[PDB]
Design an enzyme around this catalytic site. Structure first.
Site, short mmCIF file in Angstrom:
data_model
loop_
_atom_site.label_atom_id
_atom_site.label_comp_id
_atom_site.label_asym_id
_atom_site.label_seq_id
_atom_site.Cartn_x
_atom_site.Cartn_y
_atom_site.Cartn_z
N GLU A 67 0.29 -6.23 13.12
CA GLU A 67 0.36 -6.61 11.63
C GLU A 67 1.84 -7.20 11.58
OE1 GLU A 67 0.54 -6.47 7.19
OE2 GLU A 67 -1.17 -6.60 8.59
N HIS A 100 -17.07 -6.34 -6.86
CA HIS A 100 -17.21 -7.47 -5.70
C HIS A 100 -18.27 -8.29 -5.68
CE1 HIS A 100 -14.05 -4.61 -4.22
NE2 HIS A 100 -13.72 -5.63 -3.60
N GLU A 157 6.22 -13.49 5.86
CA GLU A 157 7.37 -14.15 5.83
C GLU A 157 8.00 -14.32 7.37
OE1 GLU A 157 10.70 -12.20 4.42
OE2 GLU A 157 10.63 -10.32 5.37
N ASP A 198 4.14 -3.47 13.94
CA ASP A 198 4.61 -3.91 12.72
C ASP A 198 5.62 -4.98 12.80
OD1 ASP A 198 4.61 -4.76 9.69
OD2 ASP A 198 6.00 -3.03 9.26
#
EC number: 3.1.-.-
Length: 1069
Positions: A490, A574, A494, A9
């Site tokens: 991941e 959905h 930003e 991450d």
RNA sequence: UUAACUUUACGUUGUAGCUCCCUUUCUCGAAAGAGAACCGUUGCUACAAUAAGGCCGUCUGAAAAGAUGUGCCGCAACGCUCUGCCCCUUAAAGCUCGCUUUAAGGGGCAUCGUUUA
């Protein structure tokens, strides 16, 4: 040894990581280890500036003052080599004795008198010291304060030519003092600035006049050397230097990268845009027909700019078709530019302006001639080089026109030679890769450890540091546990974003946090007897209600507002089935009555409403969506009809930003993964990472702890395709009800119970993860952390007794690893220099302007009690304007005479400040404030500790400081360290330290060492908000600590051990 | 987009010559008030320094001085080729009642390397 997937991450200041062991089929089964690694992002934190910018700035200032000192030195040495020297008006250093304070007056008299050798040398040195502004594509414009300085320069040049002034000096004296009272420029103004041409003419006229009245030394050598001193400056970066500082075109190494303001390069960009263009109509997606391209192709030349609105006008575009890629949100979106041939029109208007071009007919220079104009005007920064480069090949009238208006400046990645072989093929509708492939139809050996991140491929400091730290974490995980099967990534959205983009994101997030609470208040007052506070699904239900005019999108029957949260009354479907698209975006979520979603199953609206057969139900529904308050993206998605079932869900599952593409290629190619074969690196899509985190019961608590970074790293690591398959088939079973008493037809043969919740990585996944990450059962923040292996293991075995693989030989408490910082260099002292006169008293005086000065400052005014009327007048005006001194002292302030009249104006008064320590600067005539300590040497004597601070200026001079801080006493009375003390360790910022005091034990990263108290601050490893002041223990006293030592720590938060230093390290080599 | 890149012009600090106020103080005054000394310091102009610190090259020179130049580096990022520091693993001997020594290997961080000059 272990088959595990490494989840990362990656943030701009952190890297979370987790290892998840997998079985042969790739299901996750055990969580082996995890950690968080935090660092400082590669930018100036408050302003977003580059970290190298202060360096660059100060270095160029160094070079400027150095070159000026060298030039003035050569001026004196040339006055020495010829004529008026004195050689007795010199001194120990070599400066002229009794040189005068009148140079402007002497220069204005130099036209009417032979000046003394003294005065002559004075004005020569004065001319060379202040040699005005140079042109540096000839005389031109761009930026607002450069433009203001040239406003002043051109104004004063015109003033000399038009008015009664012979040379800049006389202008200065006469007008500047008659109307301003000063000569040289002030604060930020540039009204009195002179160009170097005017001052060179002044030098030449002074020499003429001084041959007229008898100055012996008017030599050839003196003249020519003084003028060479006044005019010479090193070249700016010319062509081949610029071509070398760029790349060399990969497709043609003999040739350089093309200039962007060239015919061929602009044509290349335009053709790529043209062939890339897509049109979205009511669910369809189509490229431009050949006729469309032809129609558009020459328009960017014909009109100044090709706008999307005009593209829609030329194409027979029906009002519901819109352009893909464009942001269609507000008002004038199609007012944007589709293409703008800036070079073509710059050249054309430059000629038009002056008569070399008709304007009714397209510019007639050749593509080659335009290419040459562009390359030359982008490769050279003066008149003479551009005229030398371009005179050979294009006529002088049009050239001279080009020199006056044109300012081109950028480059592209490919050569004019490679483009000239490429763009004739993209003119025939072929894409760039295809085109390159046909021509250059060609254009990776792996090791155990990932090699450094190439800076060439990562042209971003923040991204480069994030990826370097990620590489450190990856290589550490490999060292400790071997080669991973696959690496799942991941990275925060930003990462790779401008500072202004990130702060705008932050302000938008705050705005949305406020808007949703307003929506909840509205939901309350709408359904008043509503029990609770409402979930997010309810507010989304009401928002979709509003958006669809209170009308079900599948049946047309009005949804009844009063029943809106009745159970089963309204569903959120959905539009495209999540099982075949993995698309959970709000562009796919519609609000319908319960009665109609039972029949839909796993059907898209296209298939369910029979879009293939042009059915009346289909047209009715298509009109029902096109008349809803939906965005064109949402209306477009709801009716897709012909998408790539597999490609769409591939792009929904993956993240395709440049950072992630580069990682997925570089890691896969250059590092060994004992992974099955294809995509061994997987960059999870943030949307599905959020979704999986929510469903797996992990949703985190928003940055009250640096350990939350680990959480998503776990999630992405369990997002294996086997788990994806389980989730897919689950969602499909949910789509067509199948949850009663049925059978799972495929391989589970299990009760499709009414509650068959979302497939998890393993049972009690959330709890285990929470304990592993935070050392606390989730929901109970209030608890005490099992901060030791023993406690952690006992807690895992107590609250997860059913699961014994939650305890094994790798389960250790999470400890955030902080990147060290042991650089021994940096800013040597603070920037403002102050008076060292009253330094025996702890005082320093600095000149403060009145526009800066507020009452706190004014209290320390040196003459507060000497000139009481001035003090109280300033105080009264500021108190009128309430310490907004910009408003207070805009109008000029003056002292007054005892009869109460206006006298001398005041702009800056001297203010005494506090000064106990500092650095000796400006040849021991200035004091500066100390910088940050780069080191702390720790000694022990009598079971007490002593901290010697080491600043960077001491490192520069090479002095290993003698004394250790003594609270209260200022440095002269500090404890002198000698052989009677035992040295223990050096402390650099962010070193791991342990302090055992009587009342508690404190363990964390050394942050600061206050020098008035000798106490230290330490950051708690995870920066938990509950401890200290935002995770920082403040003012820890170590003088009387029982234990005080330093520790070593891993990049993975392992190997925590005390380290013992043999000898005190020096400051210099 | 990266990150390098001519210059100017300010700003600060020190010191000069001129100046505005003004605290102490002396003198002239019957007053009103004037006039001068140190310091503070307003404003104008000029010179110096403008990170703290470290150097080059060329030419005389016998050195050991001098001349001298579009002179050069110094607040960063990354790395591990050289070197220093920390740490770790493995193998082999022993002083002694751990510690020392040898040998091979593996990492981190830098005052080391590169960008660079």
């Amino acid at each position: 040894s272990i088959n595990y997937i490494l989840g990362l991450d990656i943030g701009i200041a952190s890297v979370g990581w987790a290892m998840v062991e997998i079985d042969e089929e790739e299901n996750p089964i055990r969580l082996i280890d995890l950690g968080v690694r935090v660092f400082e992002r590669a930018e100036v934190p408050k302003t977003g500036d580059s970290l190298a910018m202060a360096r660059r700035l100060a270095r160029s200032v160094r070079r400027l003052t150095r070159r000026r000192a060298h030039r003035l030195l050569r001026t004196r040495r040339l006055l020495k080599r010829e004529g008026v020297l004195q050689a007795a008006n010199f001194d120990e250093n070599g400066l002229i004795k009794s040189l005068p304070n009148t140079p402007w007056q002497l220069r204005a008299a130099a036209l009417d008198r032979k000046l003394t050798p003294l005065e002559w040398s004075a004005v020569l040195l004065h001319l060379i010291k202040h040699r005005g502004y140079l042109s540096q594509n000839e005389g031109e414009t761009a930026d607002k304060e450069l433009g203001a300085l040239l406003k002043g320069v051109a104004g004063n040049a015109h003033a000399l030519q038009t008015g009664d002034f012979r040379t800049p000096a006389e202008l200065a004296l006469n007008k500047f003092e008659k109307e301003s009272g000063h000569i040289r420029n002030q604060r930020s103004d540039y009204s009195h600035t002179f160009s170097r041409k005017d001052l060179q003419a002044e030098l030449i006229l002074l020499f003429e006049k001084q041959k007229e009245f008898g100055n012996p030394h008017v030599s050839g050598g003196l003249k020519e050397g003084i003028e060479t001193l006044l005019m010479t400056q090193r070249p700016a970066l010319s062509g081949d230097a610029v071509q070398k500082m760029l790349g060399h075109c990969t497709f043609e190494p003999a040739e350089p990268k093309a200039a962007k303001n060239t015919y061929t390069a602009e044509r290349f960009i335009w053709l790529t845009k043209l062939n890339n263009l897509r049109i979205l109509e009511q669910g369809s997606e189509r490229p431009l027909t050949d006729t469309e391209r032809a129609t558009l192709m020459d328009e960017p030349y014909r009109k100044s700019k090709l706008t999307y609105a005009q593209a829609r006008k030329l194409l027979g575009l029906e009002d519901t078709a819109f352009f893909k890629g464009l942001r269609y949100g507000k008002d004038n979106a199609e007012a944007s530019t589709l293409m703008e041939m800036k070079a073509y029109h710059a050249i054309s208007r430059a000629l038009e302006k002056e008569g070399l071009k008709d304007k009714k007919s397209p510019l007639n220079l050749s593509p080659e001639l335009q290419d040459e104009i562009g390359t030359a005007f982008s490769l050279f920064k003066t008149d003479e080089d551009i005229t030398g480069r371009l005179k050979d090949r294009i006529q002088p009238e049009i050239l001279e026109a080009l020199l006056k208006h044109i300012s081109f400046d950028k480059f592209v990645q490919i050569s004019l030679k490679a483009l000239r072989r490429i763009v004739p093929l993209m003119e025939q509708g072929k894409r760039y890769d295809e085109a390159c492939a046909e021509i250059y139809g060609d254009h990776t050996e792996e090791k155990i450890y990932l090699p450094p991140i190439p800076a060439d491929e990562i042209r971003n400091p923040v991204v480069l540091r994030a990826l370097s730290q990620a590489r450190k974490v990856i290589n550490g995980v490999v060292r400790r546990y071997g080669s991973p099967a696959r690496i799942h990534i991941e990275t925060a959205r930003e990462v790779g974003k401008s500072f202004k983009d990130r702060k705008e994101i932050e302000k938008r997030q705050e705005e949305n946090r406020k808007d949703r609470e307003k929506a909840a208040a509205k939901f309350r007052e709408y359904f008043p007897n509503f029990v609770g506070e409402p979930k997010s699904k309810d507010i989304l239900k009401l928002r979709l209600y509003e958006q669809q005019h209170g009308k079900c999108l599948y049946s047309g029957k009005e949804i009844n507002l009063g029943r809106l949260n009745e159970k089963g009354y309204v569903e959120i479907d959905h539009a495209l089935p999540f099982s075949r698209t993995w698309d959970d975006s709000f562009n796919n979520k519609v609000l319908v009555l319960g009665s109609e979603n039972q029949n839909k199953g796993n059907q898209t609206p296209y298939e369910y409403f029979n879009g293939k057969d042009n059915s009346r139900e289909w047209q009715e529904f298509k009109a029902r969506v096109e008349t809803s308050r939906f965005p064109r993206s949402k209306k477009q998605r709801i009716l897709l009809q012909k998408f790539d079932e597999d490609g769409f869900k591939e792009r929904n599952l993956n993240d395709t930003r440049y950072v992630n593409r580069f990682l997925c290629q570089f890691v896969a190619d250059r590092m060994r993964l004992t992974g099955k074969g294809k995509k061994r690196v997987f960059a999870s899509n943030g949307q599905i990472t959020n979704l999986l985190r929510g469903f797996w019961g992990l949703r985190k608590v928003r940055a009250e702890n640096d350990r939350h970074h680990a959480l998503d790293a776990v999630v992405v690591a369990c997002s294996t395709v086997a788990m994806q398959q389980k989730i897919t088939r689950f969602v499909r079973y949910k789509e067509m009800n199948a949850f009663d008493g049925k059978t799972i037809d495929k391989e589970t043969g299990e009760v499709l119970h009414q509650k068959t919740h979302f497939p998890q990585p393993w049972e009690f996944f959330a709890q285990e993860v929470m304990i592993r990450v935070f050392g606390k059962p989730d929901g109970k923040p209030e608890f005490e952390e099992a901060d030791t292996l023993e406690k952690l293991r006992t807690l895992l075995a107590e609250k997860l007794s059913s699961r014994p693989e939650a305890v094994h030989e790798y389960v250790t408490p999470l400890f955030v690893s902080r990147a060290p910082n042991r650089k021994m260099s940096g800013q040597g002292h603070m920037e403002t220099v102050k008076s060292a006169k009253r330094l025996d008293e702890g005082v320093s005086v600095l000149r403060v302007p009145l526009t800066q000065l507020k009452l706190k400052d004014l209290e320390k005014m040196v003459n507060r009690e000497r000139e009481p009327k001035l003090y109280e007048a300033l105080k009264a005006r500021l108190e009128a304007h309430k310490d907004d001194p910009a408003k207070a002292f805009a109008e000029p302030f003056y002292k007054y005479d005892k009869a109460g009249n206006r006298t001398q104006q005041v702009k800056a008064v001297r203010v005494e400040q506090v000064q106990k320590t500092g650095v000796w600067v400006r040849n021991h005539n200035g004091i500066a404030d100390n910088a940050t300590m780069v080191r702390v040497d720790v000694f022990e004597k009598g079971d007490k500790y002593y901290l010697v601070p080491i600043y960077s200026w001491q490192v520069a001079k090479g002095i290993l400081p003698d004394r250790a801080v003594v609270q209260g006493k200022d440095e002269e009375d500090w404890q002198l360290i000698d052989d009677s003390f035992n040295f223990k360790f050096s402390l650099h910022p962010n070193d791991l330290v342990e302090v055992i005091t009587k009342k508690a034990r404190m363990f964390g990263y050394f942050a600061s060492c206050h020098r008035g108290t000798g106490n230290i601050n330490i950051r708690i490893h995870d920066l938990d908000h509950k401890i200290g002041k935002n995770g920082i223990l403040e003012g820890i006293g170590v003088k009387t600590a029982l234990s005080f030592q330093k520790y070593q720590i891993d990049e993975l938060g392992k190997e925590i051990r005390p380290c013992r230093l043999k000898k005190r390290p020096p400051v210099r080599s």
